């Protein structure tokens, strides 16, 4: 095609007899040969701009502090996981029975076995805290 | 004089097994006349003189961790069980639980009475025996 | 010697009406001194000597069908009622229920004591009286 | 003769404070031998002769407003508390609640026993003390 | 515009060379200059007609007895509020703690303080009834 | 109409000067005179083919074993009703108070009156079982 000669940052313009016009403002074409340029991604509200849009590359979003990306190329934001939860790929989920997490942005680990260290269980744990062992 | 006794449990933690008892009458709540003694090693009240006694016990529990603990706790008197009592621990909505049971029992000479605690509970740690309020008592009815 | 008695209920099914009692002291749990007798036809404990007695009863129930039964069960002592007790049957979550009540009562010479069971329950069949654990007892306090 | 008493509460409304008692033995349920008296002004049972008594109380409550009332009600015996009892008031699903507690207590000569009611309840008005059924009783065990 | 000469009750008719034809049946134009007339509001079912539609004015609806208007120009009807509730702009709402309403179509007022009149509370109130005071 | 002469199994073809062309593959016309043939019903997944599609008749579906038809000409399948339920026209419904059904694909019948046979009730029934009578 004649359009194949139009490089990234331009589009093959059907309104101007297939010349390679530059991408309009707020658009891009990452490959050559396109009949139009693609609208640049906007990172607003909970999203902030990680990488700005150029004529040859889309903008890329991450989440504002206190939040983290979920799915795709950061299609959603989610508040950082708290005590009693860990980040999975499907979001923040409660720790399963027998495990806990006592810190924000922490991972669920199993409860301490007090008997391994020759100690007794004074207080059983939950998803939010470890067992309290006692001599 | 008279033939009677009242013992006060030492235990506070909900742990399955036989209870230990205070038997010194210098302690508040404790009574112990002649013909009745406490065997510390086996944790038994020993009845010397045979006869019919009104035997009772009571169990008070208090919630020691807020928002936690549920199930039930039982006492059993063994000379199977001559006397038994289960007290429900409510989930968190009131932080106490009481039980009382009493009965006429014929006791032989040298009869040894032991009391066993059993716990069917989630988050045991959240409840404890109210100190001074778990009691085994008896007094002689026969002349 | 002494003036006391303890009777053990024969009944197991929750059926509204007067309870029947074991009164033979050869049976475990049963006491019956002179001055106290049991009238089998009318199901009454007969008190010969007048005076003040500490009278008590207790009611233990057990769930006999899993996952079923709810409501309440009551005992009433009739010489209206001189002594009364209601025990809640929990829905299914623990398979027992206990009650205890006691009182000082003045009883006349020849006083006849009867005990009536009443049931306000769905799926009655799911609960029964725990055998050996439903008891009417008394002992004389007046010399 | 003998050394015993049983008092019947006058109070019906759930109001925090000391209970008042009927002490006239011409009233049904009331017993009062010599060595035991009731001080109306301070609402106390006065024990003349020192010794060990089996002391008990019971609390019956009835729902007086349909569909209303919840929480708990407590009794405490003061000679801190020598005897204590909490009875749960269920939300509306049965319209009665019972409690019983008993204990061997050593009482000094001139010992004065008072009973305090405390209420942790929403819609207090919906529950009242069952008249004739709130009782403080004791009898001497020591010769 | 020539259409500006067409008064209320008519429309400037594009199918008839911009003459001022009268509004068709069941329509109106409250101002002049309109290219069409607007369809008259119908008040049916729970709605009843307060004001009829004319050529120059829309019909207006209110609610049938036992109901009252909510929002806009009576866009919804709602059953009259009962004991324990008062009419707000967002509909019938329960009286807040400490207040009551014992009548239909009534307003939530605070519970009587029996102690002001030197009296005791015999029965506490609810959202549906006042306290019962006693000497 | 000329199309009236086109019999079942054909359609009056507007692209071919109103000739009676046969129905295309996977279609039918149960009456004459149609300008198009109707697409044959497919019975897939939970549905199985009771009657195959011909040129003059639609396919008909019933449900796979363990399931039964609901509504219309078997527009839905439903798992066969179990203990404690009976098949209605709106689906499987619980037996009402006083009646029971103890078999799969069974009908709710009333509880046995033990007193008719001079017997006592040992165990009351549920929606899933009859009363147990005892001598």
Swiss-Prot record, chains A, E, F:
Instruction: Give the main localization category.
Output: membrane
Which compartments is it annotated to reside in? Cell membrane
Q: Which residues lie on this side of the membrane: Extracellular?
A: 1-135
Q: Name one GO cellular component term.
A: plasma membrane
Which tissues does it occur in?
Answer: Expressed on the surface of activated T-cells.
Which GO annotations describe the biological process of this protein? apoptotic process; negative regulation of cell population proliferation; regulation of cell population proliferation; regulation of immature T cell proliferation in thymus
One GO MF annotation is: signaling receptor activity
Q: Give UniProt keywords alphabetically.
A: Cell membrane, Disulfide bond, Glycoprotein, Membrane, Receptor, Repeat, Signal, Transmembrane, Transmembrane helix
Cystine bridges: 3-12, 6-20, 23-37, 40-53, 43-61, 63-69, 74-81, 77-92, 96-108, 114-133
Topology in membrane: Single-pass type I membrane protein
Carbohydrate-modified residues = 113, 124
Q: Which stretches are TNFR-Cys repeats? A: 1-20, 22-61, 62-93, 94-134
Disease tied to this entry: Immunodeficiency 109 with lymphoproliferation: An autosomal recessive primary immune disorder characterized by recurrent sinopulmonary infections, susceptibility to infection with Epstein-Barr virus (EBV), persistent EBV viremia, and EBV-induced lymphoproliferation or B-cell lymphoma.
Q: What does this protein do?
A: Receptor for TNFSF9/4-1BBL. Conveys a signal that enhances CD8(+) T-cell survival, cytotoxicity, and mitochondrial activity, thereby promoting immunity against viruses and tumors.
User: What assembly does the database describe for this protein?
Assistant: Predominantly homodimeric, but may also exist as a monomer. Interacts with TRAF1, TRAF2 and TRAF3. Interacts with LRR-repeat protein 1/LRR-1.
User: What's the protein called, per UniProt?
Assistant: Tumor necrosis factor receptor superfamily member 9
Specify the species. Answer: Homo sapiens
Part of the full-length chain shown? 26 to 160 of 255
Swiss-Prot record, chains B, C, D:
Its function? Cytokine that binds to TNFRSF9. Induces the proliferation of activated peripheral blood T-cells. May have a role in activation-induced cell death (AICD). May play a role in cognate interactions between T-cells and B-cells/macrophages.
Residues in the Extracellular compartment per record: 1-143
Q: Where in the cell is it found?
A: Membrane
Name the UniProt key words of this record, in alphabetical order: Cytokine, Membrane, Signal-anchor, Transmembrane, Transmembrane helix
Source organism of this protein record:
Homo sapiens (Human)
Whole-protein coverage range: 89 to 242 of 254
Query: What is the protein name stated in its UniProt record?
Result: Tumor necrosis factor ligand superfamily member 9
Describe tissue expression: Expressed in brain, placenta, lung, skeletal muscle and kidney.
GO MF terms held by the record = cytokine activity; signaling receptor binding; tumor necrosis factor receptor binding; tumor necrosis factor receptor superfamily binding
The signal peptide here is none
The record's note on quaternary structure and interaction partners says: Homotrimer.
Is the keyword RNA-binding in the record?
A: no
**Which superkingdom, per the lineage?**
Eukaryota
The family classification in the record reads: Belongs to the tumor necrosis factor family.
The UniProt entry's GO biological process terms, in alphabetical order, are: cell-cell signaling; immune response; positive regulation of activated T cell proliferation; positive regulation of cytotoxic T cell differentiation; regulation of apoptotic process; regulation of T cell proliferation
Q: How does it sit in the membrane?
A: Single-pass type II membrane protein
The THD domain covers: 3-141
Q: Which GO terms describe its cellular component?
A: extracellular space; plasma membrane
Subcellular location, principal:
membrane
